[model samples]
Target: NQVRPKLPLLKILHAAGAQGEMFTVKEVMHYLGQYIMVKQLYDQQEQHMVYCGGDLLGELLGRQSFSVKDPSPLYDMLRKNLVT
Candidate 1:
């Protein structure tokens, strides 16, 4: 239940790090919204399942494999949106 929204904040933090910027709540919310929309569509297709509710950090370290794949795309989209 709680893990869903934090994903976007985490992504925002990563994005900021990538851009050499600091993290902010507003930016995180913006990116998080986009992530949720994308994930909802992804779930509808059953091609990917999103867990907006889980131990995200733990899941990433223990269960899920870390790659730039998902975060890269999300960050790219958010970055573009943030600038414009």
Candidate 2:
């Protein structure tokens, strides 16, 4: 089996923040789309490992604020430890 390298959660968080904040509707949509795609992939195939971030999600949940550099809500939903 091919081992797919997983990205670190912190790296994802930093990347999302650097790219843009979660305040904008576009950012939200972007993250949502990412979540849907990742989730769909997981649902369709039995993967080796899965992971995601949660900076934006925290903002959506009111746990965090939407700054120019915000975490990804979509990432939160996808980040999971699916070891098999």
Candidate 3:
């Protein structure tokens, strides 16, 4: 478990700027949160909604561009990608 396995189905992950540093679902969550913050994707009007408007960010949520309530969806997406 020392080596981090890059995700093939994770062009989205890389798009989140977490290409070479993620190997686990938990860590992916961490990085994604940071990415979201850095990108300021959170909605200013609705705190519950996050704005997803990009190829990579959309892929993470299984859509092209949409709004999300929580990071839970992205977590579930990457979790399934693991196929555990």
Point to the candidate with the largest TM-score.
3
CA lDDT, candidate 3, residue 36: 66
lDDT of 1 by residue, 1-84 (tens): 111223434564454332333435365555444544554423454435444434333233332322333565445444443432
RMSD of each: 12.3, 14.9, 4.0
Each prediction's Cα lDDT score? Answer: 0.42, 0.35, 0.58
Stretches of model 3 off by over 4 angstroms after superposition? 1-19, 64-72
- Model 2: how large is the Cα RMSD against the reference? 14.9
Candidate 3 local lDDT, 1-84, one digit each (tens): 322423644544465677564366565666666666677777778755666656356665675434455456665666556544
- lDDT by residue (1-84, candidate 2, tens digit) is 111112442234334342432223344345444543444322334342222224333433344222223445334533341111
> What is the C-alpha RMSD, rounded to one decimal, of candidate 3?
4.0
Who wins the lDDT comparison?
3
Answer with 2 or 3, whichever has the higher TM-score. 3
Q: Rank the candidates by lDDT, best first.
A: 3, 1, 2
- Clash counts for all predictions: 2, 7, 0
lDDT of 1: 0.42
The TM-score between candidate 3 and the true structure equals 0.55
Listed in order, each prediction's TM-score against the native is 0.29, 0.24, 0.55
